[PDB]
Symmetry: D3
Subunit: 304 residues, 6 copies
């Protein structure tokens, strides 16, 4: 929780950010969202890969043809505003575009417009406080992720999350911290809400987008950092068994950051601790906020 | 629109039926809903297959493990209440169970409870005023319906509708009234929001639930009425070409009722008008509210 | 070979029935055809299920949207004409509608019309003289039949036959008489150019159309005859192994008529001879031309 | 149209290039063909990648086991002959090998031989005169391309085109210039008769042959030219959504040459005009016939 | 354990029934087996559906082309002998045909013969003592059963069980008594080593063999018993969610007999105890050994 | 055959290495094995990639959760011992870990242990004496290899071989030396018991592990050797037709070593003899045992 929320152009007090119960998105999952993080750094509060997330918000809405009034720059300025306004140095930002109080027909009437919301608030490690250091225990779920030409997995839309709910809850019900989903073909897709990486003989592996895996921005950052460290990266389809044969395995995401996976299905991964390559990558990633890692791509956007 | 909405046990003015913008269902599609119809009949206002719809509401919530405080009888009494309170003789009722203002984690915290809403209001023919008589022009969509073990198609959940949105909007964008989706295997599934039936040589055909088709209550009623009329019904997988070789084809649903399909992909179906078997079924269905058709199953629930 | 061929409305001498080498169908497989048989019977020459084949010719062209000038009755009269004209008592008739000398673009220009041809000539048993009595040796091919929503298997079109060529030639190259194809899922579809039936514990089994099997008219006749004989018929998906466990197995088609399969992949079927149920069915089928079997459906069309 | 056509070794007047209506290829799609282009250049008339096309003609025939009497050099000499004989400086050449007047059995009798035809004539831009400059509007088809082990997509055979007909006609029926087909898995295959390329962040992307995409010779030329220009090329499986997120997208083929795609499914691609990378490639391609681009591979075959 | 084992025609003492460690079956899973039960009844010791099991033994070996020296009658006689010789009144019999000490090449040399073994011994309820009365808790496995045309699921061969090991161990590792596997399409196949049945609205449902389910002999008996009791049986494909919506669910097998399933994935089935229809079937089944159920089919084979 | 076999830590005479007929592995395919080769070289008897094979033995058992008492070093020491003890200078070693005489339940009781066996003996070329020089004739099988998430293809387990038996026996039954299997998608997987390679335009191609191909150690060696020779290697999915268009094709495996394939399905590959690239690779491979090829990786383990 925080003080204000940007709602359609104006800062509104948290308690007043309400919407009608007949809002389209509540009944039909018609919304698109993003997960962005603001980190306190050596240059003060900074939003990580800000433009890239806002660009993806526009891309997700474009696929579903949701009209967006605000431009990427407007959304970026609004985001910074929310952080200053709430006096946050570090936080989790949540942009949400949704179809509001329009008719009850599945297809909204021509000429309608969407409601936009940007909320910021402090949020710790998604998979746990000690998760980044010690790693987590994952389980391969019995539920598969969406098939290729059904519900576009490249779009970060609300309705998609019924799948993540099923995958993740099943893992947690059995004592695990997160669940790993396979696609309809039986290959590794990704975790319930985070991308999956494997390390084998010093080489980094990740499933392509065609494995029903969302084009993670953290995923993209890791691939670029790895190339700077001189680590070979291979984007290819991975079998289920590969999880038991890999030297290391970890998950990535905005909320999950970079979490090591110490075991899968009760089978220990390597030494059962955070691996050496995962460590190098974590150090290089968090080094961006200390100044140890040079921001060569302009991933740090100053809030001021 | 109407005057009141049942919200968590009490009648609230329509305009005051608001919910926080950080409600789980707005971000993750975590909601379950129903479509029920109240018809003005020879016995006064009557809710069609009321218990069955409320039973399915509980079933959809059960699959996702959403806790429901209200029993089927409570929900039924609340439904009748909304209709009387709003002075409606005929209307479309919309029960909605959703995960409210709880955390932002995909998996709701233990001990949470859902919010329930029941709204009633007048609503005409989903596919058009003259649709029931003249029929509509459908198009086979380029988007497929959800694969079998991904997002359960037997549950009527909010997030599911991103698919119906894609299928339906594509058809309407090209001049058609509705779109027909095929499953991932290339077989007929159903319309964007209505079951599909075909008539060939006096025999009724419908895809099974395993074709990613939701277990329609109108679909079930039609199969039962058809058997009363002495019409053979075959529940089997159907190829795409069957739509072009069928003597008749129609759609079923609570909102769509029984709508004839006069053409598919520009190819005329039979005579290009409502067929004889579809006619028989329409008369038998609507006859329930006139008294011509005996309600042998107890499908009519008096509102009083 | 015979004397005349019906070509676009007029009887032309066989040798003169030529068409330009730039005819669309030669380059793009754009043609639809039928296989019909005329049998010498107790009522004289009679065409078997004449209207049904002509109706299917129209259906196949309809799916591909090929314009057909002739009506079903015109085509039927033309067919009878060809048989009388050539003095045939028994023969194989071959109706062929194809896209002729039009442009070279894949999609023919609007307003074009198709060329129609009807040729009749004597033709023995497709799988061999002794095949109907002793049976044949079949082999399951390594090539699969067309997937569901790619090239419609319900249409009897020319281009489809590249598949039948592959399936059938492979079997014959290895010493077998015919090849049996599986669909993309690994279930039994049908032979290269004939439907497949299995007999197990007195029950008849056949794959549905959804197994990429063409809706055979001989197949349909057998199903109806079987029901008259009090034989249970089950139209369901069949596994590959079922061919080794079945008591009997046979193929059906216009050209192949009813051919028993004595072995599959070197594994003998039952006694390695024509089975009892297959025999009953053959007797009932050929009995239609002797008068022993009453033509209750009007399958025999007199040529006069 | 032109004056002569090479038919089985000798130049025949166009109007006399006839074949019997009972030719195997008319009924069973048993033919293999090529699309070659002759360009007027700085070195006079020149056939683009002549040997490669004739080599593929032999390869397609080899897969189906069609006997070819003519060697690659004979076919090349005959091709040049047709161009000179018809006084063409620029034209579209169409080599066609087909199973002629042999029996009516699906499998041709042993010892048979095929008929060969080579026709040349002027032909403009396949997708339109202004298509190369302005680009076209494409639509993702509801029909999928052939599954992997059914009808070999690597062979350019006649029967294959029933699929291209379905995909292309559907697009044109809805106001689009061309249709893009997905494979049975739901991934991008290619256009109805042209390969598909996408540009994203300066990188070129194309589906592999395993996506049911024919090994285009223009496709191969573009990949080689791109590498000369220092553009990274990635041959990988592509999701349907990628078409909406791509900076640029274009089609390639002998008849279509290099056509930009300005929109897909009503969604604008980048700027809605020919993109910068597509431009570079177009200039480099057409530069071959001006002398600006050095023919390092020996792609230009002088007709003389 | 017992005193003797029938080994290649002769009664050998249990302790001496050894085979070389280089036996083909030990390295390549090349064996076929059966599970048969001998019950103490009102007619004394009786082997349940003896011939049917031995017939299936021959069928499984036939699929793999393993040569069997003994006829069905000899194997039945041998089975009865082992039961008498070991003084058993009730027991579990295990016939096993395997490729013995032959070469190390995958394909055994021509002219080889198999080794046959028949061991009998007392064996309680597979899923537990109180499992038949109380029911068990099942879990849907993350591992799928063999695809249709890979390793024939209709054959009861040794190598198949690597799959059952994976499915069953996963369930037991999480606190469940048995695991339920889905096929590659995402539909219900069966338990790790027992067929699956569902009861909904008084109707019995079971997946067909094409769902990668072995043709259970107990399954076949239940279907026939149910028809005697006037219970409708439907053999059709079932979705995963159906397990949560079913009134009752139970498993069948020789070793498992008829075990009720009180919960699936933590979701209670009906009342959480053995259901009414399951009970009727159990009573009818076990009634065969008391005389209450008339053996109309000749399922009880006297040992003497 | 040889004199001794290492059995659970002790050298036992060949004839005495027996196990009970009720051993779990005999009935359920519950075993894991390796194929290793000892070559007579310039440094004396040497085991090729010894550690890698023993490492994979542990990996296969780990996937199935079979407990292994011996460490990789103990197994390597045991392997060398057997070779010395049997006075072998060149041989084929066969390590086999299997579930022994434990209960008859599919899941072995907790606390059980496995039996380990290591047998060594002389063994010639798997596909024939002159196969390495002349090449073999292969056939594409009608049986497909295991689907992705069913029975893990990355594990070299006993039960897997029912598939290899079917694929290989079918080829041999038709006059071929080996069969090539496609996966469930219709793409090339590998031979019945050896990996598959293709050479096209001087480039090496091999299917990835996700094509249901086991991670061959010989396959891995060839890829590394090829990179040393400056030959481009591409690990990608391959279509069936690619076998007919390839310049060269060969198989790899411990027992098969490097065997050229001169024809596939009766279609000659290239020149019909061992190709140039295959030859270079063979010479480089066998050169390791002569000293001509430097062992840069430490692949040769001295027996002493
Ligand atoms: C958002 C998301 C991720 C993480 O992506 P980032 O862009 O790295 O935040 C991973 N998986 C799924 C399913 C997601 O929706
Ligand atoms: C609700 C629904 C239907 C219609 O079902 P009824 O129970 O008859 O209202 C059809 N298809 C989908 C996708 C639906 O959600
Ligand atoms: C025509 C055909 C048949 C036979 O059908 P009939 O209508 O019985 O002549 C069977 N299979 C295929 C592939 C066919 O095209
Ligand atoms: C011929 C063809 C192409 C274009 O290939 P080019 O060799 O470049 O002429 C593309 N797609 C299909 C289906 C084709 O047949
Ligand atoms: C043997 C078996 C069964 C049970 O079959 P019964 O003939 O009833 O003993 C069920 N499932 C599998 C996988 C089996 O092997
Ligand atoms: C063992 C095996 C191979 C060969 O692997 P190598 O490690 O090279 O011996 C190939 N295919 C299969 C199916 C195998 O089991
Ligand atoms: C809520 C998360 C599962 C998804 C967005 C993120 O990674 O922040
Ligand atoms: C909007 C509709 C598709 C909802 C279901 C119904 O009420 O029929
Ligand atoms: C030629 C045949 C394979 C097909 C048509 C028929 O059955 O007559
Ligand atoms: C008509 C075209 C699709 C043929 C291929 C080409 O010439 O490009
Ligand atoms: C272990 C069991 C699954 C074997 C088969 C049976 O007896 O039911
Ligand atoms: C029989 C062989 C396929 C076993 C593995 C090998 O040694 O290559």
């Amino acid at each position: 929780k925080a003080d204000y929320i940007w709602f359609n152009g104006e800062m509104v007090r948290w308690e007043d950010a309400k919407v009608h119960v007949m809002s389209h998105a509540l009944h039909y999952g018609t919304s698109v969202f993003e997960g962005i993080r603001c980190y306190d750094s050596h240059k003060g509060p900074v939003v990580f890969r800000h433009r890239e997330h806002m660009q993806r918000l526009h891309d997700s809405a474009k696929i579903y043809r949701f009209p967006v009034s605000q431009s990427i720059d407007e959304l970026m300025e609004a985001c910074r505003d929310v952080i200053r306004k709430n006096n946050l140095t570090s936080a989790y930002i949540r942009p949400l575009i949704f179809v509001g109080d329009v008719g009850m027909g599945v297809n909204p009437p021509a000429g309608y417009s969407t409601d936009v919301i940007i909320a910021a608030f402090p949020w710790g490690a998604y998979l746990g406080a000690e998760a980044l250091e010690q790693g987590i225990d994952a389980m391969v779920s019995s539920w598969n992720r969406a098939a290729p030409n059904t519900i576009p997995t490249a779009a970060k839309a609300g309705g998609n999350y019924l799948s993540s709910l099923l995958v993740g809850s099943e893992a947690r019900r059995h004592g695990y911290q997160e669940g790993i989903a396979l696609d309809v073909n039986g290959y590794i897709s990704e975790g319930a809400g985070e991308n999956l990486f494997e390390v084998k003989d010093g080489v980094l592996f990740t499933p392509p987008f065609t494995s029903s895996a969302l084009p993670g921005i953290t995923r993209d950052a890791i691939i670029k950092l790895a190339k700077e460290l001189g680590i070979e990266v291979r984007e290819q389809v991975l079998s289920r068994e590969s999880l038991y044969l890999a030297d290391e395995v970890f998950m990535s995401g905005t909320a999950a950051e970079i979490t090591p996976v110490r075991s899968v299905d009760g089978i220990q991964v390597g030494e059962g601790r955070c691996g050496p390559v995962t460590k190098r990558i974590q150090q290089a990633f968090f080094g961006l906020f200390t100044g140890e890692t040079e921001d060569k791509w302009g991933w740090l956007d100053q809030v001021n």
